[PDB]
């Protein structure tokens, strides 16, 4: 990991959220399941395809390149010709191979940043309300419906509303 949030303190993902790149498993009175985040997912896509778009946009297509003929007294310029051809290939093979190794690692921990980034957008929306057991988990002191729970995912809230519900739960155990 890099940002630490994949293969991470969260050591696995979830097969059962098919809806996008990131999202929230939530459990309560009513019931449990996955809902994707359509915000940071559409952010990461449009950003990543734009990475894929950018390298290829830096590729003019090949235009016509065909071999050259030389007679038996033109050996030197023929070898010169070979040398230019090999040379340019060695470079473009390098640039293509290396870049893909490089940018893959930079893509992997791009996602690793985006899980970490969403986790704290919640923790910072929570504060007093819950505890961190780790592995993505925020356990609610105060009670929550789906709606209240769709509200963290919404980001919309108001914080003190569930505060008094939560605060005296912290004590006797």
């Amino acid at each position: 990991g890099l940002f630490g949030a994949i293969a991470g303190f969260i050591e696995g993902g979830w097969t059962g959220m098919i809806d996008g790149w990131y999202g929230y498993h939530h459990q309560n009175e009513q019931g449990s399941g996955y809902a994707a985040d359509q915000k940071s997912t559409q952010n990461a896509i449009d950003g990543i395809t734009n990475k894929v778009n950018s390298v290829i946009e830096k590729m003019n297509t090949q235009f016509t390149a065909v071999g050259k003929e030389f007679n038996n007294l033109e050996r030197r310029i023929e070898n010169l010709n070979k040398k230019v051809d090999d040379g340019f290939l060695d470079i473009w093979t390098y640039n293509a191979e290396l870049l893909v190794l490089l940018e893959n690692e930079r893509t992997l921990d791009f996602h690793d940043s985006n899980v970490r980034n969403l986790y704290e957008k919640v923790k910072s929306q929570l504060k007093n309300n819950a505890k961190e057991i780790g592995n993505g988990c925020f356990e609610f002191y105060h009670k929550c419906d789906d709606a209240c729970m769709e509200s963290v995912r919404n980001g919309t809230y108001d914080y003190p509303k569930y505060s008094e519900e939560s605060k005296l739960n912290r004590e006797e155990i």
């Binding site: 809806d19 997912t41 559409q42 449009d46």
Partner: protein, 45 residues
Amino acid sequence: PWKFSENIAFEIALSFTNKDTPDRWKKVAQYVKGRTPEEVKKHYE
């Protein structure tokens, strides 16, 4: 107009759609930026 990169936002979003289609199906189209739910529609074959 259809590009290699747009056939990048597309197929990831078709990993997000189902064989018994579990959606109003624009769940592909919000991820395409760009070209419409219209322009997305025919493009599945």
